[PDB]
């Protein structure tokens, strides 16, 4: 996260770290949506242009964390993966359309003060809150600058951007399964996700019921925190029917 701040303890209890077993390293962010299911970006697991194709046994998820590098004894919980599910129309060949994946844990994780699931949006919450200017929150342990790494989880609040501005900021083809967020050059304030934050959550706190909803998944950006560029996020609600199909069948 660029131009963010340290999270408070328990501020993002749905935060998940995707961790490579060997070499032991941060791979991506992710989020806890139930005691057995974790949501992330498909490109965190499958990206053939970079020879990336992780299997369940390659990875662990670390839940309840605050420190990036420490083993947080008696606080974090480490879970093995039972199965990975990639969206069948995830477009890794072009523009990361439908950049979404689910991971089922081998055993349920115990909730605690530090471990708790986020809500997924309904149609009405999405329609009400996914408006230009409305702010969401992005969290992660990724790099602090494009060109270094945090001691603890970072948090930044960023406004959703009008779709024509998103489209006009890039040569990439933007789809309805993406939205973009970030400040404009003339707005003064700054902030973005960066490398290592992909797969983590963009959340909004509903003013109707005071619950946190995951509206986006950190998907892609051109650099980090560049003037005139924006971060792009998977539109969780648009893909929720797939999410529910996977959870219902498996």
């Amino acid at each position: 996260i660029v131009e963010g701040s340290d999270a408070e303890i328990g501020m993002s209890p749905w935060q998940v770290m995707l961790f490579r077993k060997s070499p032991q390293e941060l791979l991506c962010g992710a989020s806890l949506i139930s005691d057995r299911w974790v949501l992330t970006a498909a490109h965190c697991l499958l990206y053939p242009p970079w020879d990336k194709n992780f299997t369940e046994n390659d990875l662990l998820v670390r839940i309840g964390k605050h420190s990036r590098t420490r083993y947080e004894r008696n606080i974090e919980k480490i879970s093995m993966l039972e199965k990975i599910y990639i969206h069948p129309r995830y477009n890794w060949r072009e523009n990361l359309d439908r950049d979404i994946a689910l991971m089922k844990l081998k055993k349920p994780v115990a909730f605690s003060d530090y471990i708790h699931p986020v809500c997924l949006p309904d149609r009405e919450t999405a329609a009400s809150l996914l408006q230009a200017g409305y702010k969401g929150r992005v969290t992660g342990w990724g790099n602090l600058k494009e060109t270094g790494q945090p001691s603890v989880l970072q948090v930044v609040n960023l406004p959703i951007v009008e779709r024509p501005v998103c489209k006009d900021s890039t040569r990439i083809r933007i789809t309805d399964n993406m939205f973009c967020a970030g400040y404009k050059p003339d707005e003064g304030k700054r902030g973005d996700a960066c490398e290592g934050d992909s797969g983590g959550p963009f959340v909004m706190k509903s003013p109707f019921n005071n619950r946190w909803y995951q509206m986006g998944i950190v998907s892609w950006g051109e650099g980090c925190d560049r003037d005139g560029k924006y971060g792009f996020y998977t539109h969780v609600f648009r893909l929720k029917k797939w999410i529910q199909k996977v959870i219902d069948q498996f």
Partner: peptide
């Protein structure tokens, strides 16, 4: 860079 995690998880 990362602290070793317990062997049980590997």
């Amino acid at each position: 860079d990362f602290e070793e995690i317990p062997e049980e998880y590997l």
